[PDB]
Amino acid sequence: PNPNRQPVELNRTSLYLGLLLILVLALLFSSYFFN
Amino acid sequence: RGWFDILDDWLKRDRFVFVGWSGILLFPCAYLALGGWLTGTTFVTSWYTHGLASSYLEGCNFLTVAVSTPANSMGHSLLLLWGPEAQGDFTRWCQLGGLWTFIALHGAFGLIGFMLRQFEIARLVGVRPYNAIAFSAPIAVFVSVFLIYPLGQSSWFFAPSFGVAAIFRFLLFFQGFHNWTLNPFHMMGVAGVLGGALLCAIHGATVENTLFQDGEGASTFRAFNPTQAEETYSMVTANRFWSQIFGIAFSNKRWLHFFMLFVPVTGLWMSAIGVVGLALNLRSYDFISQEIRAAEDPEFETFYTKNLLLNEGIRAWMAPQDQPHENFVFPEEVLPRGNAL
Amino acid sequence: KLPEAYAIFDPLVDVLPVIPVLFLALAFVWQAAVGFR
Amino acid sequence: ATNRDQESSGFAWWAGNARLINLSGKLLGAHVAHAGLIVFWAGAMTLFELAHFIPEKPMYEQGLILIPHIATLGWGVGPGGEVVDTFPFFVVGVVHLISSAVLGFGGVYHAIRGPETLEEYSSFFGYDWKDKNKMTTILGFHLIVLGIGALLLVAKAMFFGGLYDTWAPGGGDVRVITNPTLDPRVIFGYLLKSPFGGEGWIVSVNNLEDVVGGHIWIGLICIAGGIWHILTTPFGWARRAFIWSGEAYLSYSLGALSMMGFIATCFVWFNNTVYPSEFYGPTGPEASQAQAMTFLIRDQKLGANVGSAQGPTGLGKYLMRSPTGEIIFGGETMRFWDFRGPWLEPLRGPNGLDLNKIKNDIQPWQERRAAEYMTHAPLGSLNSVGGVATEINSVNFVSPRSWLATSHFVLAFFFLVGHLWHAGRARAAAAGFEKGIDRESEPVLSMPSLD
Amino acid sequence: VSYPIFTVRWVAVHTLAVPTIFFLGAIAAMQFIQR
Amino acid sequence: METLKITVYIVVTFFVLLFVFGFLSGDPARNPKRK
Amino acid sequence: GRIPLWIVATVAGMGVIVIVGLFFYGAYAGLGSSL
Amino acid sequence: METITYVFIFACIIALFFFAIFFREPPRIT
Amino acid sequence: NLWERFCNWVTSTDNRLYVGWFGVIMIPTLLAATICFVIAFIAAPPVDIDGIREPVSGSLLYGNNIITGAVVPSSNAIGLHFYPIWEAASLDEWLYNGGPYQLIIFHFLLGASCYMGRQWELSYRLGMRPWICVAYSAPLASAFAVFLIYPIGQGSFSDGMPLGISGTFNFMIVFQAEHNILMHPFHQLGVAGVFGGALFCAMHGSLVTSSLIRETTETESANYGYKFGQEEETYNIVAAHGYFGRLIFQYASFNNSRSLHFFLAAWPVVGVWFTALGISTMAFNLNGFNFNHSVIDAKGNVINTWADIINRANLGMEVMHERNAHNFPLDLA
Amino acid sequence: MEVNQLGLIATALFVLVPSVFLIILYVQTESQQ
Amino acid sequence: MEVNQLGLIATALFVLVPSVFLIILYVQTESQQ
Ligand code: CLA
Ligand code: CLA
Ligand code: CLA
Ligand code: CLA
Ligand code: CLA
Ligand SMILES: CC1=C(/C=C/C(C)=C/C=C/C(C)=C/C=C/C=C(C)/C=C/C=C(C)/C=C/C2=C(C)CCCC2(C)C)C(C)(C)CCC1
Ligand SMILES: CC1=C(/C=C/C(C)=C/C=C/C(C)=C/C=C/C=C(C)/C=C/C=C(C)/C=C/C2=C(C)CCCC2(C)C)C(C)(C)CCC1
Ligand SMILES: CC1=C(/C=C/C(C)=C/C=C/C(C)=C/C=C/C=C(C)/C=C/C=C(C)/C=C/C2=C(C)CCCC2(C)C)C(C)(C)CCC1
Ligand SMILES: CCCCCCCCCCCCO[C@@H]1O[C@H](CO)[C@@H](O[C@H]2O[C@H](CO)[C@@H](O)[C@H](O)[C@H]2O)[C@H](O)[C@H]1O
Ligand code: OEX
Ligand SMILES: [Cl-]
Ligand SMILES: [Cl-]
Ligand SMILES: [Fe+2]
16 A cells, blocks of 8 residues: 555636636637637 | 855845845846946947937937847857957947847846846745746746747847837737737737736735725725734625625635736746747748638638738838848839728 | 017916926925925 | 824825815815916916917917917907907916916915814804705805806807807808807707717707807806705705715716816817817818818819719719718718818708719818818827828827817826725715724624625 | 945945936937937 | 617616616615614 | 935936936937937 | 537536536635 | 615625626626627628628628637718617618627626726625725726727727727727827836736735745645635735845835735726727827937938838838728828 | 638547546545545 | 548547546545545
8 A cells, every 4th residue: 555645636616717727728729720 | 164155145145135146147147238228229229230220329219219139141140249240349249239139148147147036035035936936937938039039030130129119110020920919829928918917906906995994094004014913904805795796706815816926927928939939930820711711702801801911011011121131122013002091 | 479578578488387287296395395294 | 283294184195185174274275276276377378379379370280279269269360260369368368377376375375374274264164064055055156156157158259259150151250149049949959969970969069059058058057056055955865865075075076077078078079169170170070071072172173073983892982872861972081971061061962962062162262171171180199290100200280189189088087087086985984984894893794605 | 323335235326326327418418419 | 670769768768767766765874884 | 414305305306307308308309300 | 610619618618607606615704 | 665675685785796776787788788799799790890881701600710700890881870770770781780889889888887886886885995996997998998989089980999809909900000009108008007917916926925824734735724714814924025125125125015905906007097098099199109200310311210110010001901991092080 | 611620629629638637636526525 | 531520529529428427437436435
């Protein structure tokens, strides 16, 4: 058993912020991907 | 105790102006960059490099003075005073644009010295070095715009000149030739800068309007003592206000201030990436589908196609005087014009 | 032009409009004279 | 020093005029001295404009904003706006300068020498901001004074020489108004007009009869309202609707002044009746219409058929139709087809611009006026280089319409900001939290959670 | 009391201020140059 | 169009009357501290 | 031997005003005046 | 095809707005 | 009484989103503007913006992406005339002449003004100091300048800013061509406002983050060291002041948190006020500085400056913008 | 319009791979207690 | 080969949407103890 294990967390606010970042980045770059 | 330790004690002494080890790099380089800019905008012409007047001595005002970039035939020469172009002659060095590379190189090393100063003072005072990390974004902007962009281009000539109207020329050049407004990295930079200004205004106003009454003065600035332990404003009231006005609100002060760090720094870094792309002429100039449609269909018009026509006008009308080394002779009949005007 | 008998006072007229601006500046001078108390 | 520091007054130096809120004598001194400043600027600026005035050159080419106001009143001008005597301008300037000396003496006396509070000296001149009867009485006095001023404008128009009329038959001239429009239908139909294009609300008043009749109505209404507020106390709904404090009254006046500044900006930009183009230059719409007229005249003299000439897009090069069918000038000046000017109305028939009067009835004075207004369009730089932003440095011209409109938009916007500042502060000070949140009795702590 | 004179602050102040006054004199002289 | 114009005029008049009479309905009293 | 600080501030600000006004005067006269 | 993509991303953003406003982590005052 | 219950509900601070009377105006106008904007941005037919029967397509279904799409401003033939739906003979005519733009911008401007009023209203209901709405007046003034004041000064809503990304860029470029906004001091003050706002935002954020008091261990996020509603300050203001005072000098650093946050509010708000006023004052054609042919040699030859290069770029934009709309030599509006 | 074909799948992956990643880290956070 | 272009994104979605679903459940099962 490795003692260097740690639990990972991501709260709901961080989920909302990350989803907003990803969706806005996709909305920005989609026109350039389609070109 | 050793000369190094005694010099360290002297450099880190408490003073009106902190010096530190980083001061040896910072103060000469920053002073020489500022002095070179003031000297160039006061006394030095751009007549042999651009064909322009750019100093107070020639009659330019504060908006129109600049230390202009060297001539395009210099290439990416460092243009040292003792180098093979000037050959130790200060007058010829000024006339050939050596002050531009002087300011650019001393400014780069001064920016390095200032970030090292941020690190050194953070280490001495005992705080985390997030101010230096935030200052990495102006350094990225300066390196991408003043160093990487002309290095990708043909010469130092297409770097920005150190002046107000010269920087405005640089903006209009990037619009006309690169379509830099269409670039998504510049769009992220604009979002970062405007969001930083918004966050600055909104956080300042929110703090000033959720203050606790801690005095009887109708001017509330005296109601704060720096050694006090309690918060000077109500985070709960501010959170409820913005939750009911805007829908969402900060509830964590540390996250709020990290976000204030994060937004403009990330914006500036994205814009620096876009400027690297433009250094290689890797532009977001056009959308291919729209151009195929517009080529085959003479009734299809968008604001993007109108912007492309504006860019054609900028390039054709600006290039003979903005790029005098090319010896562009555009006759009047080849200039793209609309009806009348 | 002004009426001719007033022509000798033409320079003074030339500096009359800027006097209200000085009034604003005068306030700050007065405050500096009392230490901005 | 009474109330002259932060410890006794609660206000810092940068809010030091807020120390005057409850000091009626010193506040009166501040007001009278400031009124002296206003009158001083009027007189000194008039003398400055007169000292550099070249009477044969048009007023709008000389950076004048006060001489056109005197000239519109009919003082010192003849037919066509020609200056015939500069002495009324001098009289207006010097009388304002001397009166400003008197007002400055009074303001200084009440500010530093007179009694700090007027309540002990006089029940009539003393006041308390919370006394609504006294506030309405002072408002009534000032309403009567404003009504008398409006009637003074009427008296100038009807008895003491008249006003300059740009619509007078045979060019603009000084005209005595003998039949002002007293019909409430016309006056309050101006009040009820749309503010949008083609209607223009009160900015669209286009004859001096309506102007004089409106000022008769304004003077009578202001005098009646002044007597009403002298004789009556505020009602219960008014007492419950407003904050009754000095800062609150200031904020109400700030909102009113912001709205009036926006209206004055639109008035000087669009109206060529109370701002005649002989004195203020052409309006922007006027200059665009003048350019279209100028090139219609030039090409018709070259033999073109201006009615059948077709532009690049298929619209008429010189003449087209407005969306409601009127024959109007072509090009971008299609946006300015609601423009009315005395040099253009002789060519207008029932269906808009008339082709036959265009072909046969364009006089040389109209061609001169069109060329002059085309080349003095209200376009110029901040350093007063006339023309579009791409023009070279040879013409030193910015239209006074541009200066007046821009300056008063800036002032009107900042006074809207001041209204917001003082209205919010008056509300917070009346409720008692303008200094911040009480730590012990924070309201949000007594509220339920949102979620 | 017993304050010194020539400190680091003195050097910084004068390295900024001496050329500033020199340059201001130069530009003031430039205002009187004709073509 | 005429029916639409009357409908929009009625809706706008209703909301504006709500605004005006709401701010006449003792708004300075509706604050947490005083009255 | 103390000159009041308000006198020093007033004189320095007047000097700044004179220098700036000289620069604007030179904007209208001599080199850079387009004349 | 590209229009559907843009409208889909925009609608996902609006749905995210709804959930971030009405189904947020409640700020629990300690 | 039904009216008393309705007044209690409207002004209730227990609603998840506060309404208020300003919100009674704000919600329908902003809902109308939002719904019409989404529908027009997706599916509006092309609009003859310049009034020269040259329709410009701005919706996604007519060949645009997110970047190039816009709600196109109303026709130049309309000008400043009020153009509601019932003024048009049909919806096809209303869509052809850019009626959706007028609907959206009028509803949006009213709703945003009521948003400012609503910010005041909620601050009053919560016992707050009232001036957040004053800070919001700067972007609101900017919106009024680009959507209302500039069309009024220029005489047509066709010259308002298009509701799109590339339309915004078109507005910027044509504005620089016609007014030389870069050389206008109010726009320079606005750039100082936004650059300084970003700078001071990054500065304040990094200085507060730098001086956070240790409350957590190395594994967890430092943000868990702050609890919502806690009474103690989560960072050392004195340590941040000591750092920043050694970074420049002691008297360039705020030791007062209230003065610092007032400065953070005041710098970008005043800068944006000035740039909005710049747009309005250039709407009445008081343009930026003109230094074309300012520098002249002894003989009389024009010596070019950087302002002359800017003038060349402006001339290119000027002769190419609205390439079919001009019949006469001067672009007077 | 003659758009790039891979621009669909790229955009989908640009949404899908990070979002579900965050979703994974969110849901396993919620199941911890 | 003239294949259906949508097939690619279809295949990707057919792989990705249910798989990450299982991954979500599995990961939130592992963090429950
Ligand atoms: C510490 C501060 C500092 C720093 C980092 C720089 C940095 C720079 N200066 Mg600069 N400068 C400074 C202070 C500083 N300066 C001061 C105080 C002055 C006023 C006198 C100047 C005046 C000045 C001028 C006038 C010019 C520069 C230039 C330059 C650039 C090129 C220099 C070069 O190639 O030589 C690099 C030299 C070294 C790195 C020295 C190496 C020493 C090590 C220890 C090796 C040991 C050598 C050995 C003992 C001797 C060998 C003997 C024999 C074999 C040769 C560079 C960016 C040039 C420029 O900007 O071009 C556009 C230029 O023209 N400087
Ligand atoms: C239109 C501008 C204006 C006016 C009319 C006033 C008027 C006033 N201010 Mg004030 N103020 C202003 C702008 C103005 N302020 C500005 C811009 C600031 C910010 C710097 C302040 C900051 C400020 C503070 C901090 C305070 C005042 C106070 C006062 C009042 C008493 C002043 C006093 O004791 O004088 C003392 C000053 C002197 C004796 C110096 C001489 C002043 C005279 C009037 C100069 C006149 C010059 C003129 C050429 C003379 C013509 C005479 C001729 C006509 C015969 C007074 C009513 C005070 C107050 O509220 O008192 C309770 C107070 O504490 N003000
Ligand atoms: C009739 C108009 C009017 C009146 C009577 C007042 C009266 C008052 N205001 Mg107010 N205000 C107004 C308009 C008005 N305001 C407008 C239009 C705005 C919007 C900008 C404000 C914004 C405002 C704020 C933000 C505050 C006040 C405050 C106050 C109080 C103290 C003011 C003081 O001491 O200033 C002292 C004067 C100065 C410090 C000078 C300021 C210098 C100005 C800003 C620059 C002017 C530049 C000039 C026009 C052009 C350049 C000149 C050149 C020489 C450089 C006082 C009751 C204070 C308050 O609430 O107290 C209760 C306060 O904090 N006002
Ligand atoms: C807004 C203007 C205003 C107001 C309300 C006051 C109010 C007051 N002043 Mg004051 N004063 C003013 C302006 C004003 N003054 C000016 C401009 C000056 C300089 C001339 C003075 C000089 C002055 C002195 C020297 C004294 C006062 C005194 C007084 C107090 C008693 C006056 C009295 O009993 O009535 C007297 C009423 C009259 C004499 C009737 C005058 C009627 C005038 C001449 C008609 C003018 C026509 C029209 C109304 C104004 C036209 C100008 C307009 C376009 C601006 C009272 C508080 C006294 C005081 O405080 O004692 C302790 C005192 O000794 N005042
Ligand atoms: C400087 C001018 C001025 C000022 C500040 C006041 C101030 C006041 N008057 Mg008043 N009044 C005046 C001139 C003035 N009066 C004049 C000249 C007259 C004669 C006609 C009157 C006749 C008068 C009467 C008969 C009454 C008042 C009343 C009042 C009080 C309550 C005001 C109120 O709630 O109305 C605010 C306005 C409203 C409630 C109207 C509803 C708002 C609508 C929707 C605004 C629409 C306009 C919009 C902005 C568009 C503009 C263009 C439009 C014309 C189409 C207040 C003390 C009342 C009172 O208590 O007196 C004892 C009262 O009953 N006044
Ligand atoms: C390059 C070079 C060098 C260097 C030099 C130097 C270092 C110099 C310096 C110089 C300087 C150091 C100068 C200065 C200048 C300054 C000036 C010229 C100033 C001006 C100012 C003004 C004009 C002001 C303004 C203002 C503002 C900003 C705002 C408010 C208002 C006022 C007005 C106050 C050497 C030899 C080493 C080497 C070789 C090369
Ligand atoms: C309270 C106060 C204040 C204010 C004040 C004021 C604002 C005042 C005003 C004042 C004024 C408002 C004054 C006035 C004066 C005037 C005069 C004294 C005049 C005279 C005149 C004359 C002498 C004339 C002459 C002539 C003629 C006859 C004609 C020809 C030309 C000539 C010009 C030569 C301040 C802010 C400082 C602050 C503190 C306190
Ligand atoms: C001279 C003239 C004329 C005439 C005029 C007139 C006759 C006028 C009048 C006018 C008027 C008769 C006006 C009125 C106005 C009003 C106003 C401006 C109002 C305001 C209001 C307010 C401000 C309210 C507020 C409120 C609300 C919202 C609710 C609750 C609370 C309170 C109470 C706060 C004409 C144009 C023919 C022509 C030219 C000349
Ligand atoms: C276009 C609109 C403009 C024209 C119409 C307005 C002209 C001005 C006339 C004043 C009318 C104000 O009348 C106002 O009405 C409301 C509704 O009954 C009254 O009644 C209100 O009182 C209290 C607050 O005090 C509330 O809790 C109560 O529910 C409510 O009924 C107000 O006390 C009264 O002041
Ligand atoms: O519409 Mn939009 O932009 Ca104002 O200038 Mn004239 O018009 Mn058109 O040209 Mn240039
Ligand atoms: Cl265009
Ligand atoms: Cl045209
Ligand atoms: Fe903060």
